[PDB]
Design a protein around this motif. Structure first.
Motif, PDB file in Angstrom:
ATOM      1  N   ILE A 246      45.094  33.093  34.778  1.00 14.30           N
ATOM      2  CA  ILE A 246      44.813  33.010  36.208  1.00 14.30           C
ATOM      3  C   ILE A 246      43.471  33.672  36.482  1.00 14.30           C
ATOM      4  O   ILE A 246      43.219  34.797  36.034  1.00 14.30           O
ATOM      5  N   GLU A 247      42.609  32.976  37.218  1.00 15.74           N
ATOM      6  CA  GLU A 247      41.296  33.481  37.613  1.00 15.74           C
ATOM      7  C   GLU A 247      41.231  33.398  39.134  1.00 15.74           C
ATOM      8  O   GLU A 247      40.926  32.338  39.689  1.00 15.74           O
ATOM      9  N   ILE A 248      41.513  34.509  39.809  1.00 12.50           N
ATOM     10  CA  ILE A 248      41.642  34.522  41.260  1.00 12.50           C
ATOM     11  C   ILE A 248      40.828  35.679  41.824  1.00 12.50           C
ATOM     12  O   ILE A 248      40.601  36.688  41.150  1.00 12.50           O
ATOM     13  N   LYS A 249      40.370  35.519  43.064  1.00 15.43           N
ATOM     14  CA  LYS A 249      39.586  36.539  43.749  1.00 15.43           C
ATOM     15  C   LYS A 249      40.479  37.333  44.691  1.00 15.43           C
ATOM     16  O   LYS A 249      41.166  36.754  45.538  1.00 15.43           O
ATOM     17  N   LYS A 250      40.462  38.654  44.544  1.00 14.13           N
ATOM     18  CA  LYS A 250      41.251  39.540  45.383  1.00 14.13           C
ATOM     19  C   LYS A 250      40.399  40.739  45.773  1.00 14.13           C
ATOM     20  O   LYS A 250      39.427  41.082  45.098  1.00 14.13           O
ATOM     21  N   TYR A 251      40.773  41.371  46.880  1.00 17.11           N
ATOM     22  CA  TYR A 251      40.025  42.517  47.377  1.00 17.11           C
ATOM     23  C   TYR A 251      40.214  43.716  46.459  1.00 17.11           C
ATOM     24  O   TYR A 251      41.336  44.031  46.054  1.00 17.11           O
ATOM     25  N   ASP A 252      39.113  44.387  46.133  1.00 11.84           N
ATOM     26  CA  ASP A 252      39.152  45.569  45.282  1.00 11.84           C
ATOM     27  C   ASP A 252      38.912  46.806  46.134  1.00 11.84           C
ATOM     28  O   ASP A 252      37.793  46.995  46.632  1.00 11.84           O
TER      29      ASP A 252
ATOM     30  N   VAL B  16      38.485  49.969  45.506  1.00 12.86           N
ATOM     31  CA  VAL B  16      37.568  51.001  45.034  1.00 12.86           C
ATOM     32  C   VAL B  16      36.121  50.607  45.306  1.00 12.86           C
ATOM     33  O   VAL B  16      35.322  51.423  45.780  1.00 12.86           O
ATOM     34  N   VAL B  17      35.756  49.356  45.015  1.00 11.74           N
ATOM     35  CA  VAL B  17      34.387  48.909  45.259  1.00 11.74           C
ATOM     36  C   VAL B  17      34.219  48.231  46.613  1.00 11.74           C
ATOM     37  O   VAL B  17      33.081  48.096  47.083  1.00 11.74           O
ATOM     38  N   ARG B  18      35.315  47.797  47.244  1.00  8.95           N
ATOM     39  CA  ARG B  18      35.320  47.275  48.611  1.00  8.95           C
ATOM     40  C   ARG B  18      34.678  45.893  48.723  1.00  8.95           C
ATOM     41  O   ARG B  18      34.021  45.591  49.719  1.00  8.95           O
ATOM     42  N   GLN B  19      34.858  45.042  47.714  1.00  7.80           N
ATOM     43  CA  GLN B  19      34.532  43.626  47.829  1.00  7.80           C
ATOM     44  C   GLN B  19      35.649  42.803  47.205  1.00  7.80           C
ATOM     45  O   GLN B  19      36.565  43.331  46.571  1.00  7.80           O
ATOM     46  N   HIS B  20      35.557  41.489  47.393  1.00  2.41           N
ATOM     47  CA  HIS B  20      36.392  40.536  46.675  1.00  2.41           C
ATOM     48  C   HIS B  20      35.734  40.214  45.339  1.00  2.41           C
ATOM     49  O   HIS B  20      34.547  39.877  45.293  1.00  2.41           O
ATOM     50  N   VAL B  21      36.500  40.330  44.255  1.00  5.41           N
ATOM     51  CA  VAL B  21      35.988  40.106  42.910  1.00  5.41           C
ATOM     52  C   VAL B  21      37.009  39.309  42.110  1.00  5.41           C
ATOM     53  O   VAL B  21      38.177  39.192  42.484  1.00  5.41           O
ATOM     54  N   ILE B  22      36.546  38.758  40.988  1.00  4.74           N
ATOM     55  CA  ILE B  22      37.417  37.992  40.104  1.00  4.74           C
ATOM     56  C   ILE B  22      38.458  38.917  39.493  1.00  4.74           C
ATOM     57  O   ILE B  22      38.133  40.004  38.999  1.00  4.74           O
ATOM     58  N   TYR B  23      39.717  38.492  39.523  1.00  3.40           N
ATOM     59  CA  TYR B  23      40.806  39.195  38.862  1.00  3.40           C
ATOM     60  C   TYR B  23      41.355  38.324  37.741  1.00  3.40           C
ATOM     61  O   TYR B  23      41.583  37.125  37.932  1.00  3.40           O
ATOM     62  N   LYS B  24      41.571  38.924  36.574  1.00  2.00           N
ATOM     63  CA  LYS B  24      41.972  38.194  35.381  1.00  2.00           C
ATOM     64  C   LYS B  24      43.342  38.657  34.904  1.00  2.00           C
ATOM     65  O   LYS B  24      43.678  39.840  34.978  1.00  2.00           O
ATOM     66  N   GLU B  25      44.122  37.705  34.400  1.00  2.00           N
ATOM     67  CA  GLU B  25      45.481  37.991  33.960  1.00  2.00           C
ATOM     68  C   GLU B  25      45.477  38.849  32.699  1.00  2.00           C
ATOM     69  O   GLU B  25      44.611  38.708  31.833  1.00  2.00           O
ATOM     70  N   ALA B  26      46.451  39.747  32.606  1.00  2.00           N
ATOM     71  CA  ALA B  26      46.617  40.616  31.446  1.00  2.00           C
ATOM     72  C   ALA B  26      48.110  40.867  31.256  1.00  2.00           C
ATOM     73  O   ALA B  26      48.947  40.160  31.826  1.00  2.00           O
ATOM     74  N   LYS B  27      48.449  41.870  30.455  1.00  2.00           N
ATOM     75  CA  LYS B  27      49.831  42.163  30.109  1.00  2.00           C
ATOM     76  C   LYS B  27      50.352  43.347  30.915  1.00  2.00           C
ATOM     77  O   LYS B  27      49.596  44.242  31.300  1.00  2.00           O
ATOM     78  N   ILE B  28      51.664  43.338  31.171  1.00  2.00           N
ATOM     79  CA  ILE B  28      52.309  44.436  31.886  1.00  2.00           C
ATOM     80  C   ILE B  28      52.846  45.506  30.946  1.00  2.00           C
ATOM     81  O   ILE B  28      53.188  46.608  31.405  1.00  2.00           O
TER      82      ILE B  28
END
Ligand SMILES: [Mg+2]
Ligand SMILES: [Mg+2]
Ligand SMILES: [Mg+2]
Ligand SMILES: [Mg+2]
Ligand SMILES: [Mg+2]
Ligand SMILES: [Mg+2]
Ligand SMILES: [Mg+2]
Ligand SMILES: [Mg+2]
Ligand SMILES: [Mg+2]
Ligand SMILES: [Mg+2]
Ligand SMILES: [Mg+2]
Ligand SMILES: [Mg+2]
Ligand SMILES: [Mg+2]
Ligand SMILES: [Mg+2]
Ligand SMILES: [Mg+2]
Ligand SMILES: [Mg+2]
Ligand SMILES: [Mg+2]
Ligand SMILES: [Mg+2]
Ligand SMILES: [Mg+2]
Ligand SMILES: [Mg+2]
Ligand SMILES: [Mg+2]
Ligand SMILES: [Mg+2]
Ligand SMILES: [Mg+2]
Ligand SMILES: [Mg+2]
Ligand SMILES: [Mg+2]
Ligand SMILES: [Mg+2]
Ligand SMILES: [Mg+2]
Ligand SMILES: [Mg+2]
Ligand SMILES: [Mg+2]
Ligand SMILES: [Mg+2]
Ligand SMILES: [Mg+2]
Ligand SMILES: [Mg+2]
Ligand SMILES: [Mg+2]
Ligand SMILES: [Mg+2]
Ligand SMILES: [Mg+2]
Ligand SMILES: [Mg+2]
Ligand SMILES: [Mg+2]
Ligand SMILES: [Mg+2]
Ligand SMILES: [Mg+2]
Ligand SMILES: [Mg+2]
Ligand SMILES: [Mg+2]
Ligand SMILES: [Mg+2]
Ligand SMILES: [Mg+2]
Ligand SMILES: [Mg+2]
Ligand SMILES: [Mg+2]
Ligand SMILES: [Mg+2]
Ligand SMILES: [Mg+2]
Ligand SMILES: [Mg+2]
Ligand SMILES: [Mg+2]
Ligand SMILES: [Mg+2]
Ligand SMILES: [Mg+2]
Ligand SMILES: [Mg+2]
Ligand SMILES: [Mg+2]
Ligand SMILES: [Mg+2]
Ligand SMILES: [Mg+2]
Ligand SMILES: [Mg+2]
Ligand SMILES: [Mg+2]
Ligand SMILES: [Mg+2]
Ligand SMILES: [Mg+2]
Ligand SMILES: [Mg+2]
Ligand SMILES: [Mg+2]
Ligand SMILES: [Mg+2]
Ligand SMILES: [Mg+2]
Ligand SMILES: [Mg+2]
Ligand SMILES: [Mg+2]
Ligand SMILES: [Mg+2]
Ligand SMILES: [Mg+2]
Ligand SMILES: [Mg+2]
Ligand SMILES: [Mg+2]
Ligand SMILES: [Mg+2]
Ligand SMILES: [Mg+2]
Ligand SMILES: [Mg+2]
Ligand SMILES: [Mg+2]
Ligand SMILES: [Mg+2]
Ligand SMILES: [Mg+2]
Ligand SMILES: [Mg+2]
Ligand SMILES: [Mg+2]
Ligand SMILES: [Mg+2]
Ligand SMILES: [Mg+2]
Ligand SMILES: [Mg+2]
Ligand SMILES: [Mg+2]
Ligand SMILES: [Mg+2]
Ligand SMILES: [Mg+2]
Ligand SMILES: [Mg+2]
Ligand SMILES: [Mg+2]
Ligand SMILES: [Mg+2]
Ligand SMILES: [Mg+2]
Ligand SMILES: [Mg+2]
Ligand SMILES: [Mg+2]
Ligand SMILES: [Mg+2]
Ligand SMILES: [Mg+2]
Ligand SMILES: [Mg+2]
Ligand SMILES: [Mg+2]
Ligand SMILES: [Mg+2]
Ligand SMILES: [Mg+2]
Ligand SMILES: [Mg+2]
Ligand SMILES: [Mg+2]
Ligand SMILES: [Mg+2]
Ligand SMILES: [Mg+2]
Ligand SMILES: [Mg+2]
Ligand SMILES: [Mg+2]
Ligand SMILES: [Mg+2]
Ligand SMILES: [Mg+2]
Ligand SMILES: [Mg+2]
Ligand SMILES: [Mg+2]
Ligand SMILES: [Mg+2]
Ligand SMILES: [Mg+2]
Ligand SMILES: [Mg+2]
Ligand SMILES: [Mg+2]
Ligand SMILES: [Mg+2]
Ligand SMILES: [Mg+2]
Ligand SMILES: [Mg+2]
Ligand SMILES: [Mg+2]
Ligand SMILES: [Mg+2]
Ligand SMILES: [Mg+2]
Ligand SMILES: [Mg+2]
Ligand SMILES: [Mg+2]
Ligand SMILES: [Mg+2]
Ligand SMILES: [Mg+2]
Ligand SMILES: [Mg+2]
Ligand SMILES: [Mg+2]
Ligand SMILES: [Mg+2]
Ligand SMILES: [Mg+2]
Ligand SMILES: [Mg+2]
Ligand SMILES: [Mg+2]
Ligand SMILES: [Mg+2]
Ligand SMILES: [Mg+2]
Ligand SMILES: [Mg+2]
Ligand SMILES: [Mg+2]
Ligand SMILES: [Mg+2]
Ligand SMILES: [Mg+2]
Ligand SMILES: [Mg+2]
Ligand SMILES: [Mg+2]
Ligand SMILES: [Mg+2]
Ligand SMILES: [Mg+2]
Ligand SMILES: [Mg+2]
Ligand SMILES: [Mg+2]
Ligand SMILES: [Mg+2]
Ligand SMILES: [Mg+2]
Ligand SMILES: [Mg+2]
Ligand SMILES: [Mg+2]
Ligand SMILES: [Mg+2]
Ligand SMILES: [Mg+2]
Ligand SMILES: [Mg+2]
Ligand SMILES: [Mg+2]
Ligand SMILES: [Mg+2]
Ligand SMILES: [Mg+2]
Ligand SMILES: [Mg+2]
Ligand SMILES: [Mg+2]
Ligand SMILES: [Mg+2]
Ligand SMILES: [Mg+2]
Ligand SMILES: [Mg+2]
Ligand SMILES: [Mg+2]
Ligand SMILES: [Mg+2]
Ligand SMILES: [Mg+2]
Ligand SMILES: [Mg+2]
Ligand SMILES: [Mg+2]
Ligand SMILES: [Mg+2]
Ligand SMILES: [Mg+2]
Ligand SMILES: [Mg+2]
Ligand SMILES: [Mg+2]
Ligand SMILES: [Mg+2]
Ligand SMILES: [Mg+2]
Ligand SMILES: [Mg+2]
Ligand SMILES: [Mg+2]
Ligand SMILES: [Mg+2]
Ligand SMILES: [Mg+2]
Ligand SMILES: [Mg+2]
Ligand SMILES: [Mg+2]
Ligand SMILES: [Mg+2]
Ligand SMILES: [Mg+2]
Length: 51
Positions: A30-36, A38-50
RNA sequence: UCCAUAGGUGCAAGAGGCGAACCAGGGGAACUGAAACAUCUAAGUACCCUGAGGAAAAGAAAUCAACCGAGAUUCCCUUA
RNA sequence: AAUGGGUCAGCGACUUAUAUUCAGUGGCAAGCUUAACCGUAUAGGGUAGGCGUAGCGAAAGCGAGUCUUAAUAGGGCGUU
RNA sequence: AACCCACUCCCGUUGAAAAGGUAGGGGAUGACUUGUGGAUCGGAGUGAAAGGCUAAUCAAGCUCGGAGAUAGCUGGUUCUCCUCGAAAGCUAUUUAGGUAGCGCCUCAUGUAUCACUCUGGGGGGUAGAGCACUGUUUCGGCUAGGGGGUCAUCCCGACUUACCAAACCGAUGCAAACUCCGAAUACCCAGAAGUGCCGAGCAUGGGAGACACACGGCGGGUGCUAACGUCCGUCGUGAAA
RNA sequence: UUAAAAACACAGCACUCUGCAAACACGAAAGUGGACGUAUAGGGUGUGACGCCUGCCCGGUGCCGGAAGGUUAAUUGAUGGGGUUAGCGCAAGCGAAGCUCUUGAUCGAAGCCCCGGUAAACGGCGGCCGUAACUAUAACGGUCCUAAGGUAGCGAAAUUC
RNA sequence: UCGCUGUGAAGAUGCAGUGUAUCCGCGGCUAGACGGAAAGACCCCGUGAACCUUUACUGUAGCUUUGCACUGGACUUUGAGCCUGCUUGUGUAGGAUAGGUGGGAGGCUUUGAAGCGUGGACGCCAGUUCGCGUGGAGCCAUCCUUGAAAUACCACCCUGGCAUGCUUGAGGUUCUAACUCUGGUCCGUAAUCCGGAUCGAGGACAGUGUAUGGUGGGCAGUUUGACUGGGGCGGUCUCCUCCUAAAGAGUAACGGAGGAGUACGAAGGUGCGCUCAGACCGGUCGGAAAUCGGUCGCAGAGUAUAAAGGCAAAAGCGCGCUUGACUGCGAGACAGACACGUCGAGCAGGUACGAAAGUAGGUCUUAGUGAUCCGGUGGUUCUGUAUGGAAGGGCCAUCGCUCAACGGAUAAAAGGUACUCCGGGGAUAACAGGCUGAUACCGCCCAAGAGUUCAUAUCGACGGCGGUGUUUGGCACCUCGAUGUCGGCUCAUCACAUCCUGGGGCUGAAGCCGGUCCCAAGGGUAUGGCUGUUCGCCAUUUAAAGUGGUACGCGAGCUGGG
RNA sequence: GCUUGACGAUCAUAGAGCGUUGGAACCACCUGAUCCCUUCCCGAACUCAGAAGUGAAACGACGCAUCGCCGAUGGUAGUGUGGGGUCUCCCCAUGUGAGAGUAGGUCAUCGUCAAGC
């Protein structure tokens, strides 16, 4: 069923979101943009393991 | 068993037993509580045994503190 | 026709210690009060300690404020 | 026969006796009976085995200690007067005859609301009713069609509906889990007169008890619209008159 | 001290263990019994004079034998990963040696898994379809399952509703 | 300190009405005082107790395996390390040889004795080392070309294994000197103990200490839920929807019916656009139903998933872009014992669709869930036991529970008791009493029909209405600090729904006998074989061998077969 | 005031069905697809440029109750409070009062703005 995954921000922060997915129907990541907060912008979020 | 060792007799000094508690050690439960019960508790208590004394034990830092210092052991009041 | 008592006389069941909270009644009062222990022994000394005068935060810390937060915004707790 | 035993009846059962007696009964030179002395014992002994016996005590003796073990369980709890006065419910529980928070009682402090009636706003889907949906019922008509027959057509045209017949039209019933409809009461809210035992409401603290309910009426489920049956709602009485 | 019996014992039978400082039992141990005995002996287990006999199953559980191979304890400590800091560096940060915290390679017996025996070891020992000159039943054929499907004897029995 | 009939915590000497009755002994009998005796032993309960069992849980005595210690010498087999010359280097290709680097360009120790071979050889085998048969004799030509690096050269590491050295894992054999002897003979000594001495035997084994794996009801401490029209068996235990539920909310039953323990990166956001099911007609293979054209249709379709409530600004359907399924909060409410739960305008940051007003803090809504403790992972201007750090801890985010007995006792748990025991309960069963009367039994109503004909002499289908308490039940009101339960014997007392005897009506009553109904309770109303039997079946009688109530009468009257 | 458009008020007494009628303007149909824009194909719908033709269709206005929808009066059912009976059900006093049906109504009534007289 649906397995818990983890979305890690593409920025330098260690912020992550959690969700689930059907790893059989959709195997690709999954390659989705969500609000971050700490840095206070929308950035790419990448799937990883839990685990 | 050769030397001398074990062993055997004769003398001197001491011990042995009793006592309610206190002291220092050896061994050491369970009921009970946890509203059940195993870890835990009761508790190193009850009880048994061995020594000593009028008291015993411990005692003179290979100790605490914190960059300032204190100054052997025992007991009491706080920190709590 | 459920329990208990044949009768009389005597005895027989909410206590004590230490920590506390609330109420009543007193002494002092931004202060109040001593414990062990001294002692002329219910006096007097002993203020180590305890509670109060400031809170918020898990804390460092800051303080009539403080915590959360990018935010002196909002909100929680506190302040005449 | 003695001696050892204990199969039967009766008596006795407050006995002569905490296991006997009178009548009968078995063994009676043996795996026999018996005197004296000795050995083995408490999770241990001994047992030709009955869980039997170990001092009238045995599925773990007696005695003294831990010890006033623990007892959500029964029983009991002692003089007098005055004011007030319950509950037997909800929730949770290794819970169901215990306990905890809330509801109900009482005391104190503070504070301003409360009840009854009249008027004015509001939502509803129950009683009743109805068939507009979902089901369920009867009668008549009109049928699409299955075709019952069927002239009997190599097998097609159909003769014809003497069986059946969806669907539609009209008439006519029923429903806790049907509704085109729809009360009375009861619930909220606001404004007002009077009454309130001088308060009714609310908040905060001290102390509780209680959490086995019973019957009668009304509305219901369950039962057989049976039970002084059982389970709910709402009133009244008993509990505590 | 409410049960004297069909209950226990018994002679006989069988299995199994034990080579003597025996197995086994009582003892923290010394020691003692077994036994001043020695496999025609001693212990345990089941059955219970005598007569005729004692059938099938080693799949389960136990016991005995095997040892190839898999797993497998304390023990050992290869390797990798961190902590501290002499030194370098403007800083950030890198960093040898020592000490230290983890990780765990390799080594490792019995046992278990495996392989084979053993039932007078603990135990177990079935169904359904057709088929005969009247009917009836199957000597006979199929078929499923099991480790194997109850033999001889006896039977409304101390067992039978 | 009377009887009866009612009432009454439901079986009364004591209450109500009523009837009887002078006061007091003695000898007898036991119907009652739910008579005396023993805080029921049957049944249930207690987060009670004992003892017993086992493939319940957790341990443990004993038995057994291996490491270390007591514990030594030698030989041999065998794996690893270390020491040593490191010789040994043979592929396309290079006469020959390819593990590499530095000095080096040729090699003059008898040159490099030259030309083949000679014993020992090895060998990616026809190549190389070591004695050229002769003898102190000139070839390997150094890139001679090729070959990815050229020999001859002097130092530096490694390789196929030889010979040993130094350890050290394992095995076997052997020795004596540790250890062992419940073997002999000497002494202490007057002694089958015990020591010392010495022969004999075994022997670094055995055995003991410590560490560790296996086995281990031989032994031990415990666990083994609750609800429940008594307990047990069965079923249930958390969440959602409807009825019960009485028109606000809430409301119970082992009441009536169904679902859940998920799904979706688009099935979410937004902008734009569009309406279903079904019917009929016409139209090629389908023909009832495929795709198509027209008319009607108004939601009878659809909604990811049960049911209920909703759905035109459609909440239904399609397409383009997209990530608001955002971070920090949050006025105010709904629910509510608590812990939890539900809705949400608005503000600040950054976004996405739209020209814009704007919409977006998941999905039409309501199920899809599990506290704390403990442990792990990512961050962190917190803390960090003298100090600087680190370990550890705190804060934020997040993972691991059919803990389903779903507010979850522990990380970890099944049974028997007729050998039983204690505390309690008529809060709760078995016997008898009480209430009820479905069932049982006894009457009556209707009359199809049977009776040759004829409904009612005698019966009577399908249906209906009562009575009695009389069977099988329902309930759980009395009794668990005790009310003795079947059958037999002895002795009874009452009812009438009458078995005999007595009096009558009808008859499908000739007589003798019968059938049925009405009246009638005075008196009568078998003996045996079997069985514990009541009962029943048999044999033989009698005028007849009645049916019921009385704690299924009667154990302080007997028995004891069940 | 008379006619037509746009936006509202209110949601059938306002709807449906049948018939007559409207083009000067407005509106609708209409012509073409060059240019913006469009069809999971089609200028059908959306869009653009228009002015030859028509009021056919659509829309509006006007008449009719056949259907649909409203709907009394009276009576009946139920029901709060108090009291009775022959008590599974009812009755009396008082207050309240449907649903269905019957007589009968309905072919709507308004507001703002702009265009023609
Ligand atoms: Mg002394
Ligand atoms: Mg204990
Ligand atoms: Mg306890
Ligand atoms: Mg307890
Ligand atoms: Mg217990
Ligand atoms: Mg302890
Ligand atoms: Mg000790
Ligand atoms: Mg002295
Ligand atoms: Mg000293
Ligand atoms: Mg000190
Ligand atoms: Mg100093
Ligand atoms: Mg000093
Ligand atoms: Mg009495
Ligand atoms: Mg009693
Ligand atoms: Mg009682
Ligand atoms: Mg009493
Ligand atoms: Mg008494
Ligand atoms: Mg004061
Ligand atoms: Mg503030
Ligand atoms: Mg404040
Ligand atoms: Mg004698
Ligand atoms: Mg006699
Ligand atoms: Mg005699
Ligand atoms: Mg005799
Ligand atoms: Mg004899
Ligand atoms: Mg003798
Ligand atoms: Mg003794
Ligand atoms: Mg004992
Ligand atoms: Mg027995
Ligand atoms: Mg005694
Ligand atoms: Mg005795
Ligand atoms: Mg104690
Ligand atoms: Mg006591
Ligand atoms: Mg009692
Ligand atoms: Mg009063
Ligand atoms: Mg709950
Ligand atoms: Mg209880
Ligand atoms: Mg209070
Ligand atoms: Mg109704
Ligand atoms: Mg209907
Ligand atoms: Mg019909
Ligand atoms: Mg209804
Ligand atoms: Mg007053
Ligand atoms: Mg309770
Ligand atoms: Mg409570
Ligand atoms: Mg209750
Ligand atoms: Mg109850
Ligand atoms: Mg109640
Ligand atoms: Mg009640
Ligand atoms: Mg009722
Ligand atoms: Mg009822
Ligand atoms: Mg009743
Ligand atoms: Mg009742
Ligand atoms: Mg009631
Ligand atoms: Mg009441
Ligand atoms: Mg009263
Ligand atoms: Mg009471
Ligand atoms: Mg009264
Ligand atoms: Mg005998
Ligand atoms: Mg006897
Ligand atoms: Mg016996
Ligand atoms: Mg033998
Ligand atoms: Mg036998
Ligand atoms: Mg026999
Ligand atoms: Mg085998
Ligand atoms: Mg086997
Ligand atoms: Mg073996
Ligand atoms: Mg280092
Ligand atoms: Mg290994
Ligand atoms: Mg092995
Ligand atoms: Mg065999
Ligand atoms: Mg056998
Ligand atoms: Mg046979
Ligand atoms: Mg037979
Ligand atoms: Mg026979
Ligand atoms: Mg049998
Ligand atoms: Mg009298
Ligand atoms: Mg009565
Ligand atoms: Mg009476
Ligand atoms: Mg009286
Ligand atoms: Mg009386
Ligand atoms: Mg009276
Ligand atoms: Mg008398
Ligand atoms: Mg008598
Ligand atoms: Mg009597
Ligand atoms: Mg009695
Ligand atoms: Mg008692
Ligand atoms: Mg009792
Ligand atoms: Mg019992
Ligand atoms: Mg329990
Ligand atoms: Mg309990
Ligand atoms: Mg011996
Ligand atoms: Mg000797
Ligand atoms: Mg020797
Ligand atoms: Mg050894
Ligand atoms: Mg050993
Ligand atoms: Mg050992
Ligand atoms: Mg060892
Ligand atoms: Mg056991
Ligand atoms: Mg046990
Ligand atoms: Mg075990
Ligand atoms: Mg045991
Ligand atoms: Mg215990
Ligand atoms: Mg227990
Ligand atoms: Mg448990
Ligand atoms: Mg229970
Ligand atoms: Mg039950
Ligand atoms: Mg019952
Ligand atoms: Mg059960
Ligand atoms: Mg309601
Ligand atoms: Mg209501
Ligand atoms: Mg309730
Ligand atoms: Mg379910
Ligand atoms: Mg959707
Ligand atoms: Mg729906
Ligand atoms: Mg719309
Ligand atoms: Mg509220
Ligand atoms: Mg934009
Ligand atoms: Mg905007
Ligand atoms: Mg825990
Ligand atoms: Mg430090
Ligand atoms: Mg840290
Ligand atoms: Mg529970
Ligand atoms: Mg629960
Ligand atoms: Mg629990
Ligand atoms: Mg048990
Ligand atoms: Mg008892
Ligand atoms: Mg008791
Ligand atoms: Mg009762
Ligand atoms: Mg109960
Ligand atoms: Mg009885
Ligand atoms: Mg009864
Ligand atoms: Mg009846
Ligand atoms: Mg006839
Ligand atoms: Mg009756
Ligand atoms: Mg009766
Ligand atoms: Mg009851
Ligand atoms: Mg009674
Ligand atoms: Mg009882
Ligand atoms: Mg009594
Ligand atoms: Mg009695
Ligand atoms: Mg008699
Ligand atoms: Mg009578
Ligand atoms: Mg009569
Ligand atoms: Mg009769
Ligand atoms: Mg008669
Ligand atoms: Mg007669
Ligand atoms: Mg007659
Ligand atoms: Mg008579
Ligand atoms: Mg008679
Ligand atoms: Mg008579
Ligand atoms: Mg008479
Ligand atoms: Mg007469
Ligand atoms: Mg007889
Ligand atoms: Mg007879
Ligand atoms: Mg008999
Ligand atoms: Mg009688
Ligand atoms: Mg009777
Ligand atoms: Mg009876
Ligand atoms: Mg009786
Ligand atoms: Mg009788
Ligand atoms: Mg008797
Ligand atoms: Mg009797
Ligand atoms: Mg008697
Ligand atoms: Mg009696
Ligand atoms: Mg008697
Ligand atoms: Mg008997
Ligand atoms: Mg007898
Ligand atoms: Mg009216
Ligand atoms: Mg009306
Ligand atoms: Mg109407």
């Amino acid at each position: 069923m649906r397995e818990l995954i983890r979305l890690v921000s593409s920025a330098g922060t260690g912020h992550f979101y959690t969700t689930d997915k059907n790893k059989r129907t959709k195997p690709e990541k999954i390659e989705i943009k969500k609000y971050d907060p700490v840095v206070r912008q929308h950035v790419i979020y990448k799937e990883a393991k839990i685990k």
